Design a protein around this ligand. Structure first.
Ligand SMILES: C[C@]1(c2cc(NC(=O)c3cnc(OCF)cn3)ccc2F)N=C(N)SC[C@@H]1c1ccccc1
Length: 376
């Protein structure tokens, strides 16, 4: 506990393509790069020679492969994958010194799922069984890991932003070299997604003053498998209005705020100072107690290489708040499953300037925080 040198820097990727970890599957071990995804619950790997794929799982080569004789069909908002369920032996080379028998969905057909030019061949769904396909009886990888080994029921993520990105997934613990200051914990409201409650939103310390239920309509989640900070429609328009007001030193086309246009500045002359900070107050551990996380334009204006051009990476949502890479790149994030809570601390690797840094601050007095959660 406290130091996991072998797991530091075990994540790689490209901007906009996500963060992957090296895994092995089968006997003998077949090496695959696997997207780290806290917003889903399936371990699903390429099993057929799709042209975008560097590598794929070849079940015929594995002596420890067991066919579950069951299909799985996963349409989602932005694509589709389908596969054949099985089990096999799985290890993480730059993770704990263990081997686990895990459920594997062998992907046999997909659409808009694999990224052309990416270096990953599968997805590690790190959320809970309730959202696993086809149903909650398919035990997620991390559940299998904890059940079969002495690995503590905790993992933590340091996602380091920017073409190449990196970071750390500490499996079974916390590495104190990855953050500065203190960890502040928010309750996991329900174990399906990593669902949290946002109690207050500020743009440059100016409260949006919305009914806090709007912030979590219909949920708020922490998702390493999403790029943007996604906000419910009503919250998004309030936030953009305020961000526009604060940044009115320079005028931008309306399309930029909708992510339909890039904005460019002469190399290394990006006016970070004109753009406001964004604070999300999260439900704390104690009644009437909250803390806030604060991100910079360096997090929400993402570099696009095609002199210095940027995409606005805050976007409107109909699925509730999604705290994607935009949020997570500011913070060391502790998924403390054992204690049903998520910890946030200022990341040792977050992108900032000489004037401002990302911040995790508390405690604050916030009443009626339970009222902020949405119920069907
Ligand atoms: C499995 C799923 C998913 C995610 C991605 N992610 C990415 O490509 C990506 C790109 N850049 C990032 O940061 C910047 F570097 C982060 N991630 C790609 C394909 C996918 F199918 N995970 C989700 N959380 S959202 C939809 C989907 C999903 C979720 C739930 C149920 C089914 C499918």
């Amino acid at each position: 506990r406290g130091s996991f040198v072998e797991m530091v820097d075990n994540l790689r990727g490209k901007s906009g393509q996500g963060y992957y970890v090296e895994m092995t599957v089968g006997s003998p071990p077949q090496t695959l790069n696997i997207l780290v995804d806290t917003g889903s619950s399936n371990f699903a790997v390429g099993a057929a020679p799709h042209p975008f794929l560097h590598r794929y799982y070849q079940r015929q080569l594995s002596s420890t492969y067991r066919d579950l004789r069951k299909g799985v069909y996963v349409p989602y908002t932005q694509g589709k994958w389908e596969g054949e369920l099985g089990t096999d032996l799985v290890s993480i080379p730059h993770g704990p010194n263990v081997t686990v028998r895990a459920n594997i969905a062998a992907i046999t057909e997909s659409d808009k799922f694999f990224i052309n030019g990416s270096n990953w061949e599968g997805i590690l769904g790190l959320a809970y069984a309730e959202i696993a396909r086809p149903d909650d009886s398919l035990e997620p990888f991390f559940d299998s890991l904890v059940k079969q080994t002495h690995v503590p029921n905790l993992f933590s993520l340091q996602l380091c932003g920017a073409a190449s990105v990196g970071g750390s997934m500490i499996i079974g613990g916390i590495d104190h070299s990855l953050y500065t200051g203190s960890l502040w914990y928010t309750p996991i409201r329900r174990e399906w997604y990593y669902e949290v409650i946002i109690v207050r939103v500020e743009i440059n310390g100016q409260d949006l003053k919305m009914d806090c239920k709007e912030y979590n309509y219909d949920k708020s989640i922490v998702d390493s498998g999403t790029t943007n900070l996604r906000l419910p429609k009503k919250v998004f328009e309030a936030a953009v209005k305020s961000i526009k007001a604060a940044s009115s030193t320079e005028k931008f086309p309306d399309g930029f705020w909708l992510g339909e246009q890039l904005v460019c500045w002469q190399a290394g002359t990006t006016p970070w100072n004109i753009f406001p900070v964004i604070s999300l107050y999260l439900m704390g551990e104690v009644t009437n107690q909250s803390f806030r996380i604060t991100i910079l334009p360096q997090q929400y204006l993402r570099p696009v290489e095609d002199d210095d051009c940027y995409k606005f990476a805050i976007s409107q949502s109909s699925t509730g708040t999604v705290m994607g890479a935009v949020i997570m790149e500011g913070f060391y994030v502790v998924f403390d499953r054992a204690r049903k809570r998520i910890g946030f601390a200022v990341s040792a690797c977050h992108v900032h300037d000489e004037f401002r840094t990302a911040a995790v601050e508390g405690p604050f007095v916030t009443l009626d925080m339970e009222d902020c959660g949405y119920n069907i």
